[PDB]
């Protein structure tokens, strides 16, 4: 004996197993009705009394495999699968069943063939019993995990959010199977079906408050185990470097809720798995990590939420050191680039957007002297793009206000740091176009145009 | 329904627990700061 | 003061941009008021001297 | 004031603390296993390249 205790200390597994163990099944009526064998019904009826009162031991488990495969009733296979799953996880009774099932793979394949059929409870009990033996060192099979993951019966219970116990048991079995490195390759193919329920399970708990005690997603035992298993399922699959790039590129929109989930929740299991999920994807061992770090920090603005989340600490200080190491790699990875090449490529691309390094005076200070190549052609090109967006591509729109507010806010730092920009701005024509943006809408961009007009008005007259 | 937290010395826990419980407080359990995680 | 929980990071991040924008608007309004007061004070002196 | 509320709250706090400690121990074991796996894989790759 000595099997793992997966799906044994959870309240959802004992609550779902309590309904199966509470009801009784008449194996003698099914055997007299020509639905099961007499020896399998007598061994199945004696196995329930021998599992408690009883606890070559695996000799009685041989008739239950043929009786469950021959019979078609989900109640007898659910009760026999519940008694075999309860006797398999124990360390004092049914020790020969783990050695008999681990020694013979035909009984494991016959027990796995009965699962994923009929009700979702018998498929969850048979899949948890086959996943418990497959997760140990006695036997291993990736074809049973890939064939079980390809079936819609096992993924249908985990995809449904109405049952937190069935999705929590399937998420815990997928996390225990995903804990091994061989199962992550076959389990990584079907991550698109399990990723929306895992993201909606964290977004649903993050969308609701965690102060009052309720049956929903909260700070109770079920919500912390479901959110910890949901974050631990993506955290176990985030160890691969190739999976972190495609997971960060595909689930970039749903991955932004991990920073708000750690600040909203008080448990360290969601903040540690949320910080470890971004910290594992932000490593230098994954291919194309600079595109995911620059896309997450530039697009998602993960640097301000990571800087604000880095101040608030809690228990599990190793996750705080992982978030502190991820914040320095995230800010140091994007801040290490050249500001002149990024400003020249951003001005040449005709796309202005607000960034963390785009609103600092240190980036425009070093790029102010390097921008002068011919009569300040960089500031004349940026002012020519800002005024050219005002001439063609008319204003009072959503698209022109971002580039107009970015160019007007960026022109204030260059006009304030360099007093010689008034000649290039007045010669190019941005001074007359800068005053027209204040009278219109976009009062944030009108405030940036009021700041650039105040900076030009400060140097125009003292 | 709402989580309440109070702090005081261990000499008036019965008087503060009776006055706090007499105004609608229920499920009052005295603990410390080193007994939790 | 609501009975539900609150976050200090949302208040600090929601107040830092308002404090910086209020400080920049106050400094630009004070500099524009000082420049407008200087030009308005020098306009009548320039017209009387001219 | 009541005696059952202190036992129910102490039992729920002890069960939540035990579940949080078990989850933190499992996460620490998984992180240590992943760090040991990458730490073995790097030196194994370097020694395999040099031997190659």
Topology:
This is part of a larger assembly, with one copy of chain A (462 residues), two copies of chain B and one copy of chain D (52 residues).
Chain A: H1 11-22, H2 27-32, H3 38-52, H4 62-70, H5 74-89, H6 95-103, H7 105-114, H8 120-134, H9 142-150, H10 152-159, H11 164-177, H12 183-187, H13 191-207, H14 221-237, H15 241-250, H16 257-264, H17 268-281, H18 289-299, H19 302-311, H20 317-335, H21 339-349, H22 361-371, H23 377-391, H24 398-417, H25 421-428, H26 430-439, H27 443-460
Helix pairs in contact in A: 1-11, 3-4, 4-7, 5-8, 6-7, 7-8, 8-10, 8-11, 10-11, 11-14, 13-14, 13-16, 14-17, 16-17, 16-19, 17-20, 18-20, 19-20, 22-24, 23-24, 23-25, 24-27, 26-27
Chain B: H1 13-21
Chain D: H1 3-51
GO molecular function (chain A): proton-transporting ATPase activity, rotational mechanism
Main location (chain A): membrane
Membrane topology (chain A): Peripheral membrane protein
Structure description:
- The structure is cut from a larger assembly and holds 1 copy of chain A (462 residues), 2 copies of chain B and 1 copy of chain D (52 residues).
- Chain A is mainly alpha-helical.
- Chain A is built from 27 helices and no strands.
- Chain A is elongated.
- Chain B contains 1 helix and no strands.
- Chain D has 52 residues and is mainly alpha-helical.
- In chain D, 94% of the residues lie in helices and 0% in strands.
- Chain D has one helix at residues 3-51.
- The longest helix of chain D has 49 residues, at 3-51.
- Classes of the chains: A mainly alpha (462), B mainly alpha (37), D mainly alpha (52).
- Chains in contact: A-B, A-C, A-D, B-D.
């Amino acid at each position: 004996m000595g099997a793992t205790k997966i799906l044994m200390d959870s309240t959802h597994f004992n609550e779902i197993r309590s309904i199966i163990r509470s009801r009784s099944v008449a194996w003698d009526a099914l055997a007299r009705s020509e639905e099961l064998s007499e020896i399998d019904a007598s061994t199945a009826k004696a196995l329930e009394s021998i599992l408690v009162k009883k606890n070559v031991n695996g000799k009685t488990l041989i008739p239950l495999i043929h009786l469950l495969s021959t019979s078609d009733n989900e109640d007898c296979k659910k009760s026999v699968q519940n008694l075999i799953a309860e006797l398999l996880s124990s360390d004092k009774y049914g020790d020969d069943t783990v050695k008999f099932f681990q020694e013979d793979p035909k009984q494991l394949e016959q027990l796995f063939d009965v699962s994923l059929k009929g009700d979702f409870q018998t498929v969850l009990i048979s899949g948890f019993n086959v996943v418990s033996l497959l997760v140990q060192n006695g036997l291993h099979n990736v074809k049973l995990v890939e064939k079980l993951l390809k079936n819609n019966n096992l993924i249908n219970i985990l995809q449904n959010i109405e049952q937190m116990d069935t999705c929590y048991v399937c998420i815990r079995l997928l996390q225990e199977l995903a804990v091994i490195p061989e199962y992550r390759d076959v389990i990584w193919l079907h991550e698109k079906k399990f990723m929306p329920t895992l993201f909606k399970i964290l977004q649903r708990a993050t969308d609701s408050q965690l102060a009052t005690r309720i049956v929903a997603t909260n700070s109770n035992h079920l919500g912390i185990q479901l959110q910890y298993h949901s974050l631990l399922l993506i955290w176990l699959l985030t160890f691969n470097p190739v999976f972190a790039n495609e997971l960060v590129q595909k689930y970039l929109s749903d991955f932004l809720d991990l920073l708000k989930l750690v600040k909203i929740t008080i448990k360290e299991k969601v903040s540690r798995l949320c910080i470890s999920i971004i910290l594992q994807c932000c490593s230098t061992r994954v291919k194309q990590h600079k595109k995911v770090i620059k896309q997450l920090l530039l697009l998602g603005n993960a640097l301000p939420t990571v800087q604000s989340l880095s101040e608030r600490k809690y228990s599990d200080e190793e996750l705080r050191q992982d978030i502190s190491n991820l914040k320095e790699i995230l800010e140091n990875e994007y801040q290490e680039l050249t500001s002149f090449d990024e400003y020249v490529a951003e001005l040449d691309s005709k796309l202005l957007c607000w960034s963390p390094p785009h609103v600092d005076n240190g980036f425009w200070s070093d790029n102010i002297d390097e921008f002068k190549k011919d009569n300040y052609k960089i500031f004349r090109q940026l002012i020519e793009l800002l005024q050219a967006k005002v001439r063609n591509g008319d204003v009072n729109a959503k698209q022109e206000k971002i580039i107009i507010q970015v160019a007007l806010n960026d022109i204030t730092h260059v006009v304030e740091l360099l007093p010689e920009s008034i000649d290039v701005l007045d010669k190019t024509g941005g001074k007359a176009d800068i005053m027209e943006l204040l009278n219109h809408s976009d009062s944030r961009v009108k405030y940036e145009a009021l700041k650039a007009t105040q900076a030009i008005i400060g140097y125009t007259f003292k | 329904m709402a989580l309440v937290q109070f702090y005081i010395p261990q000499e008036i826990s019965r008087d503060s627990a009776y006055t706090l419980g007499q105004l609608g407080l229920v499920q009052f359990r005295d603990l410390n700061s080193k007994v939790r995680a | 003061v609501p009975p539900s929980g609150s976050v200090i990071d949302d208040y600090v991040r929601n107040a830092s941009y308002l404090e910086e924008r209020l400080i920049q608007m106050e400094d630009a309004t004070d500099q524009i008021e000082v420049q407008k007061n200087d030009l308005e004070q020098y306009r009548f002196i320039l017209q009387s001297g001219d | 004031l009541t005696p059952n509320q202190v036992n129910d709250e102490l039992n729920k706090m002890q069960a939540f603390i035990r579940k949080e400690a078990e989850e933190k121990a499992k996460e620490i074991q998984l992180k240590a296993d992943q760090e040991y796996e990458i730490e073995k894989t790097n030196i194994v790759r370097n020694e395999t390249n040099n031997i190659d």
